[PDB]
CSV table of N, CA and C and ligand atoms in Angstrom, one decimal:
chain,number,residue,atom,x,y,z
A,1,UNK,N,-90.7,-17.3,-25.8
A,1,UNK,CA,-90.5,-16.2,-26.1
A,1,UNK,C,-89.9,-15.4,-27.2
A,2,UNK,N,-89.0,-16.8,-28.1
A,2,UNK,CA,-88.4,-16.4,-29.1
A,2,UNK,C,-88.8,-18.2,-30.3
A,3,UNK,N,-89.0,-17.6,-30.8
A,3,UNK,CA,-89.4,-18.6,-32.1
A,3,UNK,C,-87.9,-19.4,-32.4
A,4,UNK,N,-87.1,-18.2,-32.7
A,4,UNK,CA,-85.7,-19.0,-33.2
A,4,UNK,C,-84.5,-18.9,-32.2
A,5,UNK,N,-83.7,-19.8,-31.8
A,5,UNK,CA,-82.6,-19.8,-30.5
A,5,UNK,C,-81.3,-19.2,-31.5
A,6,UNK,N,-81.3,-19.9,-32.2
A,6,UNK,CA,-79.9,-19.9,-33.3
A,6,UNK,C,-79.8,-17.9,-33.6
A,7,UNK,N,-81.0,-17.3,-33.3
A,7,UNK,CA,-80.7,-16.2,-33.4
A,7,UNK,C,-81.5,-15.1,-31.8
A,23,UNK,N,-49.4,-0.6,-19.9
A,23,UNK,CA,-47.9,-0.1,-20.8
A,23,UNK,C,-46.7,-1.5,-21.0
A,24,UNK,N,-46.5,-1.6,-22.5
A,24,UNK,CA,-45.6,-2.8,-22.7
A,24,UNK,C,-44.1,-2.4,-22.3
A,25,UNK,N,-43.7,-1.0,-22.9
A,25,UNK,CA,-42.9,-0.2,-21.9
A,25,UNK,C,-42.6,0.6,-20.7
A,26,UNK,N,-41.8,0.2,-19.6
A,26,UNK,CA,-42.2,0.9,-18.4
A,26,UNK,C,-40.9,2.0,-18.7
A,27,UNK,N,-41.3,3.3,-17.7
A,27,UNK,CA,-40.2,3.8,-17.6
A,27,UNK,C,-39.3,3.3,-17.4
A,28,UNK,N,-38.4,2.5,-17.0
A,28,UNK,CA,-37.5,2.4,-16.8
A,28,UNK,C,-37.1,0.7,-16.8
A,29,UNK,N,-36.1,0.5,-17.0
A,29,UNK,CA,-35.0,-1.4,-17.7
A,29,UNK,C,-35.5,-2.3,-16.7
A,30,UNK,N,-35.7,-3.4,-16.6
A,30,UNK,CA,-36.0,-4.3,-15.6
A,30,UNK,C,-35.2,-4.8,-14.8
A,31,UNK,N,-35.2,-4.8,-13.7
A,31,UNK,CA,-33.8,-5.0,-12.8
A,31,UNK,C,-33.9,-6.6,-12.5
A,32,UNK,N,-32.8,-6.8,-12.2
A,32,UNK,CA,-32.5,-8.6,-12.5
A,32,UNK,C,-32.1,-8.6,-11.0
A,33,UNK,N,-32.8,-9.7,-10.3
A,33,UNK,CA,-33.0,-10.4,-9.2
A,33,UNK,C,-32.1,-11.4,-8.8
A,34,UNK,N,-31.5,-11.5,-7.9
A,34,UNK,CA,-30.4,-12.5,-7.6
A,34,UNK,C,-30.6,-14.2,-7.7
A,35,UNK,N,-30.3,-15.1,-8.2
A,35,UNK,CA,-30.5,-16.2,-8.3
A,35,UNK,C,-31.3,-17.1,-6.8
B,109,UNK,N,-15.3,-1.4,0.5
B,109,UNK,CA,-16.3,-2.6,0.3
B,109,UNK,C,-17.1,-3.7,-0.9
B,110,UNK,N,-18.1,-4.4,-0.6
B,110,UNK,CA,-18.5,-4.9,-2.4
B,110,UNK,C,-19.0,-4.2,-2.8
B,111,UNK,N,-19.6,-3.9,-4.4
B,111,UNK,CA,-20.4,-3.3,-5.1
B,111,UNK,C,-21.4,-3.6,-4.7
B,112,UNK,N,-21.9,-2.3,-4.4
B,112,UNK,CA,-23.7,-2.5,-3.9
B,112,UNK,C,-24.6,-2.8,-5.0
B,113,UNK,N,-26.0,-3.1,-4.8
B,113,UNK,CA,-26.8,-3.6,-5.6
B,113,UNK,C,-27.3,-2.6,-6.9
B,114,UNK,N,-27.5,-0.9,-6.0
B,114,UNK,CA,-27.7,0.0,-6.7
B,114,UNK,C,-26.5,0.6,-8.0
B,115,UNK,N,-25.2,0.3,-7.3
B,115,UNK,CA,-24.0,0.9,-8.4
B,115,UNK,C,-23.9,-0.6,-9.3
B,116,UNK,N,-24.0,-1.8,-8.9
B,116,UNK,CA,-23.6,-2.5,-10.5
B,116,UNK,C,-24.9,-2.4,-11.0
B,117,UNK,N,-23.7,-3.2,-12.6
B,117,UNK,CA,-24.4,-3.1,-13.6
B,117,UNK,C,-24.6,-4.5,-14.2
B,118,UNK,N,-23.1,-5.3,-14.2
B,118,UNK,CA,-23.2,-6.4,-15.2
B,118,UNK,C,-24.3,-7.9,-14.2
B,119,UNK,N,-25.1,-8.5,-14.7
B,119,UNK,CA,-25.8,-9.1,-14.0
B,119,UNK,C,-26.1,-10.7,-13.4
B,120,UNK,N,-24.3,-10.8,-14.0
B,120,UNK,CA,-23.5,-12.2,-13.4
B,120,UNK,C,-23.4,-12.2,-12.1
B,121,UNK,N,-23.5,-13.1,-11.2
B,121,UNK,CA,-23.5,-13.7,-10.0
B,121,UNK,C,-21.9,-13.2,-10.0
B,122,UNK,N,-20.9,-12.5,-9.2
B,122,UNK,CA,-20.1,-12.4,-8.5
B,122,UNK,C,-19.2,-13.2,-7.7
B,123,UNK,N,-18.0,-13.9,-7.8
B,123,UNK,CA,-17.3,-14.9,-6.9
B,123,UNK,C,-17.1,-13.9,-6.3
B,124,UNK,N,-16.8,-14.2,-4.8
B,124,UNK,CA,-16.1,-13.2,-3.8
B,124,UNK,C,-15.3,-14.4,-2.9
B,125,UNK,N,-13.8,-15.1,-3.8
B,125,UNK,CA,-13.4,-15.9,-2.9
B,125,UNK,C,-12.8,-15.5,-1.6
B,126,UNK,N,-12.7,-14.6,-0.8
B,126,UNK,CA,-12.7,-14.4,0.5
B,126,UNK,C,-10.8,-14.7,0.6
B,127,UNK,N,-10.7,-15.4,1.5
B,127,UNK,CA,-9.5,-15.5,2.4
B,127,UNK,C,-8.3,-16.1,1.0
B,128,UNK,N,-9.1,-16.6,0.0
B,128,UNK,CA,-7.3,-17.2,-0.7
B,128,UNK,C,-7.0,-15.7,-1.6
B,129,UNK,N,-7.8,-14.6,-1.4
B,129,UNK,CA,-7.3,-13.3,-2.1
B,129,UNK,C,-7.3,-12.2,-1.3
B,130,UNK,N,-8.2,-12.1,0.0
B,130,UNK,CA,-7.8,-10.6,0.6
B,130,UNK,C,-6.8,-11.2,1.7
B,131,UNK,N,-6.0,-10.9,1.5
B,131,UNK,CA,-4.5,-11.6,2.4
B,131,UNK,C,-3.6,-10.9,1.8
B,132,UNK,N,-2.1,-10.5,3.0
B,132,UNK,CA,-0.6,-10.3,2.2
B,132,UNK,C,0.0,-10.8,1.5
B,133,UNK,N,0.3,-9.8,0.4
B,133,UNK,CA,0.8,-10.3,-1.1
B,133,UNK,C,2.6,-9.6,-0.4
B,134,UNK,N,3.6,-10.1,-0.5
B,134,UNK,CA,4.8,-9.2,-0.1
B,134,UNK,C,5.7,-9.3,-1.4
B,135,UNK,N,6.1,-7.9,-2.2
B,135,UNK,CA,6.7,-8.6,-3.4
B,135,UNK,C,8.5,-8.3,-3.3
B,136,UNK,N,9.1,-8.3,-4.2
B,136,UNK,CA,10.2,-8.1,-4.3
B,136,UNK,C,10.6,-6.5,-3.1
B,137,UNK,N,11.5,-7.0,-2.6
B,137,UNK,CA,12.4,-5.8,-1.7
B,137,UNK,C,12.8,-4.5,-2.6
B,138,UNK,N,13.1,-3.0,-2.7
B,138,UNK,CA,13.7,-2.9,-3.0
B,138,UNK,C,15.1,-1.9,-2.7
B,139,UNK,N,15.6,-1.0,-2.9
B,139,UNK,CA,17.6,-0.8,-1.9
B,139,UNK,C,17.5,0.6,-2.0
B,140,UNK,N,16.9,1.5,-0.8
B,140,UNK,CA,17.4,2.9,-0.5
B,140,UNK,C,18.8,2.6,-0.6
B,141,UNK,N,19.3,3.6,-1.9
B,141,UNK,CA,20.8,4.1,-1.4
B,141,UNK,C,20.4,5.6,-1.6
B,142,UNK,N,21.6,6.2,-1.1
B,142,UNK,CA,21.5,8.3,-1.4
B,142,UNK,C,21.3,8.4,-2.2
B,143,UNK,N,21.5,8.3,-3.2
B,143,UNK,CA,21.0,9.2,-4.3
B,143,UNK,C,19.6,8.3,-4.9
B,144,UNK,N,18.9,7.7,-4.5
B,144,UNK,CA,17.6,7.0,-4.9
B,144,UNK,C,16.4,7.9,-5.5
B,145,UNK,N,15.8,8.0,-6.6
B,145,UNK,CA,14.7,9.2,-7.4
B,145,UNK,C,13.8,8.7,-6.2
B,146,UNK,N,13.1,7.4,-6.5
B,146,UNK,CA,11.8,6.9,-6.4
B,146,UNK,C,10.9,5.9,-7.4
B,147,UNK,N,10.4,5.1,-6.9
B,147,UNK,CA,9.5,4.2,-7.5
B,147,UNK,C,8.3,4.2,-7.4
B,148,UNK,N,7.1,3.5,-7.8
B,148,UNK,CA,6.1,3.1,-8.7
B,148,UNK,C,6.2,1.6,-8.3
B,149,UNK,N,4.6,1.3,-8.3
B,149,UNK,CA,3.8,0.7,-8.5
B,149,UNK,C,2.5,0.9,-8.6
B,150,UNK,N,1.9,-0.1,-9.7
B,150,UNK,CA,0.6,0.3,-10.4
B,150,UNK,C,-0.7,-0.7,-10.1
B,151,UNK,N,-1.7,-0.9,-9.3
B,151,UNK,CA,-2.3,-1.8,-8.9
B,151,UNK,C,-4.4,-1.7,-9.6
B,152,UNK,N,-4.5,-3.1,-10.1
B,152,UNK,CA,-3.9,-4.4,-9.7
B,152,UNK,C,-3.1,-5.2,-10.3
B,153,UNK,N,-2.1,-4.2,-11.3
B,153,UNK,CA,-1.1,-5.2,-12.3
B,153,UNK,C,-0.5,-5.6,-11.1
B,154,UNK,N,0.2,-5.2,-10.1
B,154,UNK,CA,1.0,-5.8,-8.9
B,154,UNK,C,0.7,-7.1,-8.6
B,155,UNK,N,-0.4,-7.1,-9.1
B,155,UNK,CA,-0.4,-8.7,-8.6
B,155,UNK,C,-1.4,-9.8,-9.3
B,156,UNK,N,-1.5,-9.5,-10.5
B,156,UNK,CA,-2.0,-10.7,-11.6
B,156,UNK,C,-1.7,-11.5,-12.0
B,157,UNK,N,-0.1,-11.7,-11.8
B,157,UNK,CA,0.2,-13.1,-12.0
B,157,UNK,C,0.5,-13.7,-10.3
B,158,UNK,N,-0.1,-12.8,-9.5
B,158,UNK,CA,1.1,-13.9,-8.0
B,158,UNK,C,-0.7,-14.6,-7.3
B,159,UNK,N,-0.3,-15.7,-7.4
B,159,UNK,CA,-1.6,-15.8,-6.1
B,159,UNK,C,-3.0,-16.7,-6.9
B,160,UNK,N,-4.0,-16.7,-5.7
B,160,UNK,CA,-5.1,-16.7,-6.5
B,160,UNK,C,-5.3,-15.5,-6.6
B,161,UNK,N,-5.5,-14.6,-6.7
B,161,UNK,CA,-5.7,-13.1,-6.7
B,161,UNK,C,-5.6,-13.5,-8.1
B,162,UNK,N,-4.1,-13.5,-8.3
B,162,UNK,CA,-3.9,-13.5,-10.0
B,162,UNK,C,-4.7,-14.1,-10.8
B,163,UNK,N,-4.6,-15.7,-10.6
B,163,UNK,CA,-6.2,-16.3,-11.4
B,163,UNK,C,-6.8,-15.8,-11.4
B,164,UNK,N,-8.0,-15.3,-10.9
B,164,UNK,CA,-9.2,-14.7,-10.9
B,164,UNK,C,-9.0,-13.8,-11.6
B,165,UNK,N,-7.7,-13.3,-11.2
B,165,UNK,CA,-8.2,-11.3,-12.3
B,165,UNK,C,-8.0,-11.8,-14.1
B,166,UNK,N,-7.3,-13.3,-13.7
B,166,UNK,CA,-7.2,-13.7,-15.3
B,166,UNK,C,-8.3,-14.4,-16.0
B,167,UNK,N,-9.1,-14.9,-14.9
B,167,UNK,CA,-9.9,-15.5,-15.5
B,167,UNK,C,-11.2,-15.2,-15.7
B,168,UNK,N,-11.4,-14.1,-15.6
B,168,UNK,CA,-12.3,-13.2,-15.3
B,168,UNK,C,-12.1,-11.9,-16.0
B,169,UNK,N,-13.1,-11.8,-16.5
B,169,UNK,CA,-13.2,-9.8,-17.4
B,169,UNK,C,-13.0,-8.8,-16.2
B,170,UNK,N,-14.3,-9.0,-15.5
B,170,UNK,CA,-14.5,-8.3,-14.6
B,170,UNK,C,-13.8,-8.4,-13.1
B,171,UNK,N,-13.3,-7.3,-12.8
B,171,UNK,CA,-12.5,-7.5,-11.3
B,171,UNK,C,-12.4,-6.1,-10.5
B,172,UNK,N,-12.7,-5.9,-9.4
B,172,UNK,CA,-13.2,-5.3,-8.5
B,172,UNK,C,-12.5,-5.3,-6.9
B,173,UNK,N,-11.7,-4.1,-6.4
B,173,UNK,CA,-11.0,-4.4,-4.8
B,173,UNK,C,-10.5,-3.1,-4.3
B,174,UNK,N,-10.7,-3.2,-2.7
B,174,UNK,CA,-9.9,-1.9,-2.7
B,174,UNK,C,-8.2,-3.0,-2.1
B,175,UNK,N,-7.6,-2.4,-1.0
B,175,UNK,CA,-6.3,-2.3,-0.6
B,175,UNK,C,-5.7,-1.8,0.7
B,176,UNK,N,-4.9,-2.9,0.9
B,176,UNK,CA,-4.2,-2.7,2.1
B,176,UNK,C,-2.5,-2.3,1.9
B,177,UNK,N,-2.4,-1.4,1.8
B,177,UNK,CA,-1.1,-1.1,1.4
B,177,UNK,C,-0.2,-0.6,2.5
B,178,UNK,N,0.9,-1.5,2.8
B,178,UNK,CA,1.8,-1.5,4.0
B,178,UNK,C,3.3,-1.3,3.2
B,179,UNK,N,4.0,-0.2,3.8
B,179,UNK,CA,5.9,0.0,3.2
B,179,UNK,C,6.5,-0.2,4.3
B,180,UNK,N,7.4,-0.7,4.3
B,180,UNK,CA,8.4,-1.2,5.3
B,180,UNK,C,10.0,-1.0,5.0
B,181,UNK,N,10.4,0.7,6.0
B,181,UNK,CA,11.6,0.2,5.9
B,181,UNK,C,12.5,0.3,7.1
B,182,UNK,N,13.1,0.2,7.6
B,182,UNK,CA,14.2,-0.1,9.0
B,182,UNK,C,15.6,0.4,8.7
B,183,UNK,N,15.6,1.3,10.1
B,183,UNK,CA,17.0,2.0,9.6
B,183,UNK,C,17.1,2.1,11.2
B,184,UNK,N,18.6,2.9,11.4
B,184,UNK,CA,19.2,2.9,13.1
B,184,UNK,C,18.4,4.3,13.2
B,185,UNK,N,18.7,4.0,14.7
B,185,UNK,CA,18.2,5.6,16.0
B,185,UNK,C,19.6,6.6,15.1
B,186,UNK,N,20.6,6.4,14.7
B,186,UNK,CA,21.3,7.0,14.1
B,186,UNK,C,21.8,7.4,12.2
B,187,UNK,N,20.4,7.2,12.0
B,187,UNK,CA,20.3,7.1,9.9
B,187,UNK,C,19.6,8.1,9.8
B,188,UNK,N,18.9,8.7,9.1
B,188,UNK,CA,18.0,9.9,8.9
B,188,UNK,C,17.5,9.9,7.3
B,189,UNK,N,16.2,10.0,7.4
B,189,UNK,CA,16.0,10.2,5.8
B,189,UNK,C,14.3,9.8,5.7
B,190,UNK,N,13.8,10.7,5.3
B,190,UNK,CA,12.3,10.2,4.9
B,190,UNK,C,11.4,10.1,3.9
B,191,UNK,N,10.3,9.0,3.7
B,191,UNK,CA,9.9,8.8,2.1
B,191,UNK,C,8.7,9.4,2.4
B,192,UNK,N,8.1,9.5,1.2
B,192,UNK,CA,6.8,10.1,1.0
B,192,UNK,C,5.8,8.9,0.2
B,193,UNK,N,5.1,8.4,1.0
B,193,UNK,CA,4.5,7.2,0.4
B,193,UNK,C,2.6,8.0,0.0
B,194,UNK,N,2.3,7.7,-1.4
B,194,UNK,CA,1.5,8.0,-1.6
B,194,UNK,C,0.8,7.6,-3.0
B,195,UNK,N,-0.4,7.3,-2.5
B,195,UNK,CA,-1.5,6.7,-3.5
B,195,UNK,C,-2.6,7.6,-4.6
B,196,UNK,N,-2.2,7.5,-5.2
B,196,UNK,CA,-2.1,8.4,-6.6
B,196,UNK,C,-3.2,7.7,-7.7
B,197,UNK,N,-4.5,8.0,-7.7
B,197,UNK,CA,-5.4,7.5,-8.7
B,197,UNK,C,-5.2,7.5,-10.1
B,198,UNK,N,-5.8,6.7,-10.7
B,198,UNK,CA,-5.1,7.2,-12.2
B,198,UNK,C,-4.0,7.7,-12.1
B,199,UNK,N,-2.9,6.6,-11.8
B,199,UNK,CA,-1.8,7.5,-12.5
B,199,UNK,C,-1.2,7.2,-13.9
B,200,UNK,N,-1.8,8.5,-14.4
B,200,UNK,CA,-1.1,8.4,-16.1
B,200,UNK,C,0.1,8.9,-15.7
B,201,UNK,N,1.4,7.8,-16.6
B,201,UNK,CA,2.3,8.5,-17.1
B,201,UNK,C,2.9,9.4,-18.3
B,202,UNK,N,3.8,10.1,-18.3
B,202,UNK,CA,4.1,10.8,-19.6
B,202,UNK,C,5.3,11.3,-19.9
B,203,UNK,N,5.8,10.9,-21.2
B,203,UNK,CA,7.5,11.4,-21.5
B,203,UNK,C,8.0,12.1,-21.7
B,204,UNK,N,9.4,13.0,-21.4
B,204,UNK,CA,9.9,14.0,-21.7
B,204,UNK,C,10.0,14.6,-23.4
B,205,UNK,N,9.0,13.8,-23.9
B,205,UNK,CA,8.5,14.0,-25.2
B,205,UNK,C,10.2,14.4,-26.1
B,206,UNK,N,10.7,13.6,-26.4
B,206,UNK,CA,12.2,13.6,-26.5
B,206,UNK,C,13.4,14.7,-26.2
B,207,UNK,N,13.0,15.3,-24.9
B,207,UNK,CA,13.8,16.2,-24.7
B,207,UNK,C,13.8,17.7,-25.0
B,208,UNK,N,13.4,17.7,-26.0
B,208,UNK,CA,12.9,18.3,-26.7
B,208,UNK,C,11.7,19.5,-26.4
B,209,UNK,N,11.3,18.4,-26.3
B,209,UNK,CA,9.6,18.4,-26.1
B,209,UNK,C,9.0,18.3,-27.8
B,210,UNK,N,9.2,18.3,-28.6
B,210,UNK,CA,8.5,18.1,-30.5
B,210,UNK,C,8.8,17.0,-30.6
B,211,UNK,N,9.3,15.7,-30.1
B,211,UNK,CA,8.7,14.2,-30.4
B,211,UNK,C,7.0,14.3,-28.8
B,212,UNK,N,6.3,13.3,-29.6
B,212,UNK,CA,4.9,12.8,-29.4
B,212,UNK,C,5.0,11.1,-28.6
B,213,UNK,N,6.2,11.3,-28.6
B,213,UNK,CA,6.4,9.7,-27.7
B,213,UNK,C,5.9,9.2,-26.5
B,214,UNK,N,5.9,7.7,-26.0
B,214,UNK,CA,4.6,7.5,-25.4
B,214,UNK,C,5.3,6.4,-24.6
B,215,UNK,N,5.0,6.3,-23.3
B,215,UNK,CA,5.6,5.3,-22.3
B,215,UNK,C,5.1,4.5,-22.6
B,216,UNK,N,6.8,3.4,-22.7
B,216,UNK,CA,6.0,1.4,-23.2
B,216,UNK,C,5.4,1.0,-22.2
C,301,CL,CL1,10.5,9.7,-20.3
C,302,K,K1,-37.0,-0.8,-12.8
């Protein structure tokens, strides 16, 4: 059929800190 | 109480040494005389050089705690007198301003 084949960064608040 | 997570701001894990610092420390005894004016102590200043509490207070920038304050005074059933023992938060001291009130001196 075809003759030619080749043809938000900042959220509302500051990040929380999680316990280690 | 220990500081809750909702109120904390510093992010490092705190050290809570417990029994080595939450215990009773007895300071130098005062002598009550018929003409005594009264005394004061500042917290936590009183213990910054005493025991493991003192060491932690000096090794860390941040400190926090409550206190159980116990004042003792014995006398006989024939003695009389009354001491008012009170806790004044943020006890800022002032001077007599040179007596005349003209000198803006400060407590040392
Ligand atoms: Cl003064
Ligand atoms: K957040």
